[PDB]
Design a protein around this motif. Structure first.
Motif, PDB file in Angstrom:
ATOM      1  N   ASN B 108       0.838  -1.203   0.000  1.00  0.00           N
ATOM      2  CA  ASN B 108       0.000   0.000   0.000  1.00  0.00           C
ATOM      3  C   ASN B 108       0.872   1.251   0.000  1.00  0.00           C
ATOM      4  O   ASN B 108       0.958   1.961   1.006  1.00  0.00           O
ATOM      5  CB  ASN B 108      -0.949   0.019   1.196  1.00  0.00           C
ATOM      6  CG  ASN B 108      -1.950  -1.106   1.166  1.00  0.00           C
ATOM      7  OD1 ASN B 108      -3.069  -0.942   0.677  1.00  0.00           O
ATOM      8  ND2 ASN B 108      -1.563  -2.258   1.719  1.00  0.00           N
ATOM      9  N   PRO B 109       1.495   1.571  -1.137  1.00  0.00           N
ATOM     10  CA  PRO B 109       2.458   2.687  -1.163  1.00  0.00           C
ATOM     11  C   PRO B 109       1.835   4.078  -1.077  1.00  0.00           C
ATOM     12  O   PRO B 109       2.572   5.033  -0.788  1.00  0.00           O
ATOM     13  CB  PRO B 109       3.184   2.498  -2.506  1.00  0.00           C
ATOM     14  CG  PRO B 109       2.230   1.677  -3.342  1.00  0.00           C
ATOM     15  CD  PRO B 109       1.498   0.792  -2.384  1.00  0.00           C
ATOM     16  N   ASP B 110       0.538   4.255  -1.354  1.00  0.00           N
ATOM     17  CA  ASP B 110      -0.079   5.567  -1.174  1.00  0.00           C
ATOM     18  C   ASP B 110      -0.894   5.669   0.098  1.00  0.00           C
ATOM     19  O   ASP B 110      -1.775   6.537   0.191  1.00  0.00           O
ATOM     20  CB  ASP B 110      -0.956   5.961  -2.364  1.00  0.00           C
ATOM     21  CG  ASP B 110      -0.136   6.299  -3.585  1.00  0.00           C
ATOM     22  OD1 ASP B 110       0.276   5.378  -4.322  1.00  0.00           O
ATOM     23  OD2 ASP B 110       0.175   7.510  -3.743  1.00  0.00           O
ATOM     24  N   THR B 111      -0.620   4.809   1.073  1.00  0.00           N
ATOM     25  CA  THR B 111      -1.254   4.857   2.379  1.00  0.00           C
ATOM     26  C   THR B 111      -0.211   5.296   3.398  1.00  0.00           C
ATOM     27  O   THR B 111       0.977   4.976   3.265  1.00  0.00           O
ATOM     28  CB  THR B 111      -1.845   3.487   2.719  1.00  0.00           C
ATOM     29  OG1 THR B 111      -2.753   3.133   1.683  1.00  0.00           O
ATOM     30  CG2 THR B 111      -2.579   3.488   4.051  1.00  0.00           C
ATOM     31  N   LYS B 250      -9.969   3.804   2.294  1.00  0.00           N
ATOM     32  CA  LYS B 250      -9.707   4.452   1.016  1.00  0.00           C
ATOM     33  C   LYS B 250     -10.977   5.019   0.400  1.00  0.00           C
ATOM     34  O   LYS B 250     -10.908   5.972  -0.380  1.00  0.00           O
ATOM     35  CB  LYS B 250      -9.048   3.464   0.057  1.00  0.00           C
ATOM     36  CG  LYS B 250      -7.521   3.448   0.147  1.00  0.00           C
ATOM     37  CD  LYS B 250      -6.920   2.318  -0.683  1.00  0.00           C
ATOM     38  CE  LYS B 250      -5.410   2.273  -0.521  1.00  0.00           C
ATOM     39  NZ  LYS B 250      -4.836   0.912  -0.722  1.00  0.00           N
TER      40      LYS B 250
HETATM   41 MG   LIG Z   1      -2.060   2.415  -1.220  1.00  0.00          MG
END
Ligand SMILES: [Mg+2]
Ligand SMILES: [Mg+2]
Ligand SMILES: [Mg+2]
Lengths: 253, 251, 248
Positions: B108-111, B250
């Protein structure tokens, strides 16, 4: 359908009594779904078991008064005090230890009341240490008196050694300051003989008869043999000064 | 003689004279106690429901402190969803969670993942407190990526439940801190940035009723929030469970 | 028509008003709670062991969780999981047996699962759990046992436990700062997660009474015959025997 009014009510409930499954199931199901009744029943249960337990302990105190008030046990306060506070404690009980400052305050605040000390062992493995501490305490009490027994008692607690950390070596090390070398040697020889100090045997038998086995407790009661259940209070070893003080006043009244 | 309708007349009589039917039901319950078990499980379920609803409210009330820019984090500052973690380095469940949290971060790189150093063992084992102070010091002086390396490296020791030593911490901390930055957290102080962070984390946990570790809060960072996007898990959990919480947060 | 049967049919259809007065009656005559626990104990005497083992295996991760208080090695070969409710003043004294078992088995792990049975004061259970949790976390398993036995001894002489009883004992085990934070959480009404987790496990294990015991090796093994479930009070030899099977 219809029927005589005077007969319906009594007959309907007598029928359910005779044949309880149908109404028992439907009401039990209702109760499983409105279980708030459980919360109130449980409160009533424990409120009444507390009172029933206390009453039963009071009966035991009245039955064993002579043993509870034995002049063979170390005490402070007047021997003919109108009220007595009997204390079952183990030196390695960690919360008995922390209660010691409260007891000392009670004793100073009630010089007219008799405080009786019942040393006993909560667990089997404590018998050697509890018995040894009772031997020393009895020597101190018999040769130097109650106030000095109380210094020894508090000093043993002040080691802060509880719940298995108090050893015979610890007791002897403190005891050399309260006993003459001859008394100390006599206590060592008795302990090594395998004999169990008589006060420990007597106190444990009394604790079992009082249903205090393994459980520190206070008994507060008038000394003169009066069957007034209303002047006796049995209290957990963990309590407050106010609670013990009220029990003292009830035992004097 | 007066006559009436059996059903309601009987019901009205029982209601005004309950004792005899009462005894019947008491006896029925004693002989069919599965109904009291059922009643007790329903009270338990009500408790679970009210607990999760209260947790979610607490997370919304303490959002700003949960998402504070002052705590260590990786991922986008203004990620749509945030994962907040409270942990002690010697908590055995926190240690087992460690690789799970690594996977989740890689997945989850955009969390935003937020780390609340919460050394509940520091009275039992002061090395737990030292390790929290070092973690804070790595964040304050090196940023989030270095903090994460430190954090994963320390869990990699496998040393939990009292076994973590000063030497374990110092040996690993040298790779993230200069001698002076490390020397500054060898003992706790009564003020300073590390003290203030650990203290606010503690007060946050108390506000959330996280009395143990680990604990997880998953929630949208946006103030406009549906309670259905907020997940609070006050113990250990599985990767799948956190991943679904992240999807809900999200939107 | 006949009053009895049609009167009964009418309550079965319309149970609510009778349910309400019975609920009021049950709160005033709570003896049925004690009798119900005896009936539950009897069913468990003849409950089937293979079906309890399968339950224990299904919940092994929760039974063996590091987050519950314990003594003995974390990585012990065998674990003894004790479920108990502090508010049974009339149950059998297990402390002497467990003290003996811990002495005799220094390399076995003993785990403590406190929970509320259906007849206990649940707020008191919650306060007892919050205190024990702090003691466990800040001082470890032996001190947790100290506290645990102290509370049983207090409840025995008192005959019941209130929150005041727990607070009065707790001051000897927590610093004022810790106790203030426990009192804050308790009186706010927050639901204690550890207690709710313990209760959920007890319910999943069909442990509706106190005490209850699961004995099992800690390594996930294929042998169901190294697991023993004793859903009630029991003796030292019985538990010693279960430990021996778990250790082989
Ligand atoms: Mg993410
Ligand atoms: Mg002297
Ligand atoms: Mg062993």
């Amino acid at each position: 359908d219809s029927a005589p009014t005077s007969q319906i009510g009594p007959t309907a409930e007598a029928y359910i009594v005779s044949h309880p499954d149908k109404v028992g199931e439907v009401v039990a199901t209702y109760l499983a779904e409105h279980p708030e009744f459980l919360v109130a029943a449980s409160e009533t249960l424990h409120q009444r078991q507390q009172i029933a337990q206390q009453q039963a302990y009071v009966q035991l105190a009245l039955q064993y008064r002579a043993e509870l008030l034995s002049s063979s046990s170390p005490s402070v306060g007047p021997n003919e005090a109108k009220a007595a506070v009997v204390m079952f404690f183990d030196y390695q009980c960690s919360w008995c230890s922390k209660m010691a400052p409260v007891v000392e305050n009670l004793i100073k605040a009630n010089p007219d009341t008799r405080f009786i000390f019942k040393e006993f062992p909560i667990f089997s493995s404590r018998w050697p240490v509890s018995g040894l501490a009772a031997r020393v305490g009895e020597q101190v009490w018999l040769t130097q008196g109650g106030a000095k027994y109380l210094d020894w008692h508090n000093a043993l607690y002040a080691t802060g050694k509880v719940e298995g950390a108090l050893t015979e070596h610890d007791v002897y090390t403190l005891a050399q300051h309260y006993l003459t070398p001859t008394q100390l040697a006599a206590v060592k020889e008795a302990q090594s003989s395998g004999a169990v100090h008589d006060a420990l045997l007597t106190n444990q038998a009394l604790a079992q008869h009082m249903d205090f086995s393994g459980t520190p407790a206070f008994v507060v009661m008038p000394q003169t043999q009066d069957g007034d259940v209303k002047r006796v209070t049995v209290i957990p070893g963990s309590t407050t000064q106010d609670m013990l003080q009220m029990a003292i006043q009830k035992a004097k009244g």
